[PDB]
């Protein structure tokens, strides 16, 4: 039979059968209970709208993501999300399909063990396998080397790989991602008068960020230009009218990636954690990693980031090496495409964690040889 390549993610759940080009169903991972009282009788009001249904009734719900930073903080809601994904968005019972979840690097063990225990006890799948979210993104590019920066919505991690041999001592995981950029944008919009507070209006700020923000090639020059002319002010129409005008908030929101001091984080930007991740590698594979830097994940879709990052790394790196940044147009679904490719391989067909194996060793089987 065919395998189910699910990809929990944090912000958008992407799923679909193995062997295709794009995920079959992509929908936000939010579960929102209603918060008001409700007076109409017999309206058929449910107790929790999940997935894309709660992005249409969000006016009277309190949306809450079940995955904070890679890790899962609310297991009941995550189980609900998985149940919805299997039964309503794909309509395939899990009793007859292997599953291939994905997990960020350096995550707590208990999260992974609970994930496998749920998949084997509640949904009762035949066999499931958990894979690191960066190796798949390297599969999708058709490479076999390279250092991949997978800046998702929950957590940004940077896994270097050479000739198929991952370097476990050079993984640099940073917890700044799209959600913190949404919060920072929502916080700097208040400087013009627009106040978004409700958990429903966070979605509106996210839409503003997606449609308007861009990464500046040079920050100081853009700050000077936006403060003199008015060629940058782009307007946007809220879900009820009252258009708003975003000035130099456009390139200040995604600039937080390269200067995490804006949101008070100590660490260095995504332009310098990649160079540090490279320098921890051996001295003889640094040229190949320099030449095959891969971008993935949703948050790396800002217009103009593949040039800013290249300029920064070229500034840091030695002058002789060539710096090349691979930015495929299908960046958002790169991890899932790689997952489909991996699940479609014949050599991989015996790596699944078969159910009888789980019955013999318990949920701690995932840390064992079947990784």
């Amino acid at each position: 039979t065919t395998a189910l390549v699910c990809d929990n993610g944090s912000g958008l759940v992407k799923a679909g059968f193995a062997g295709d080009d794009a995920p079959r169903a992509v929908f936000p991972s939010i579960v929102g209970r209603p918060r008001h009282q409700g007076v109409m009788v017999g309206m058929g009001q449910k107790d929790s709208y999940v997935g894309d249904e709660a992005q249409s009734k969000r006016g009277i719900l309190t949306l809450k993501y079940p995955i904070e930073h890679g890790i899962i903080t609310n297991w009941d809601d995550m189980e609900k999300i998985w149940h919805h994904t299997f039964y309503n968005e794909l309509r395939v019972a899990p009793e007859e399909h292997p599953t291939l979840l994905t997990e960020a690097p350096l995550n707590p063990k208990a999260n992974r063990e609970k994930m496998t225990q749920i998949m084997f006890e509640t949904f009762n799948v035949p066999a499931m396998y958990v894979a690191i979210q960066a190796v798949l993104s390297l599969y999708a590019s058709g490479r076999t080397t390279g250092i991949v920066l997978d800046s998702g919505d929950g957590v940004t991690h940077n896994v270097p790989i050479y000739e198929g041999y991952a370097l476990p001592h050079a993984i640099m995981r940073l917890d700044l991602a799209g959600r913190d950029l949404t919060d920072y944008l929502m916080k700097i919009l208040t400087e013009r008068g627009y106040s978004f507070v409700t958990t429903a209006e966070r979605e509106i700020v996210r839409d503003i960020k997606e449609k308007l923000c861009y990464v500046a090639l040079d920050f100081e020059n853009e700050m000077a230009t936006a403060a003199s002319s008015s060629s940058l002010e782009k307007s946007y129409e809220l879900p009820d009218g009252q258009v708003i005008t975003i000035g130099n908030e456009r390139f200040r929101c995604p600039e937080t990636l390269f200067q995490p001091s804006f949101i008070g984080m100590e660490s260095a930007g995504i332009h310098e954690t990649t160079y540090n991740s490279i320098m921890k590698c051996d001295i003889d594979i640094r040229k190949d990693l320099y030449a095959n830097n891969v971008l993935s994940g949703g948050t790396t879709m800002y217009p103009g980031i593949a040039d800013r990052m290249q300029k920064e790394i070229t500034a840091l790196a030695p002058s002789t090496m060539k710096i090349k940044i691979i930015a495929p147009p299908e960046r958002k679904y790169s991890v899932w495409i790689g997952g489909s490719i991996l699940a479609s391989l014949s050599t991989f067909q015996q790596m699944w964690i078969s159910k009888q194996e789980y019955d013999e060793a318990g949920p701690s089987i995932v840390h064992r040889k079947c990784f």
């Binding site: 090349k324 495929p328 147009p329």
Partner: protein
């Protein structure tokens, strides 16, 4: 509606066409850049040999 229908269909076809064009051109630009870089490495080899 019919007017909106035709507008929607035509815009969708134009969008898909532009996407396919830019994707294939991106693949082409990748290939030509590979040509350039690999040729440059040949240049370095030749320089070392001559010196």
């Amino acid at each position: 509606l019919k007017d909106a229908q035709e507008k929607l269909e035509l815009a969708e076809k134009k969008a898909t066409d532009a996407e396919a064009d830019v994707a294939s051109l991106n693949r082409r630009i990748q290939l030509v850049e590979e040509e350039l870089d690999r040729a440059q490495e040949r240049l370095a080899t030749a320089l070392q040999k001559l010196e």
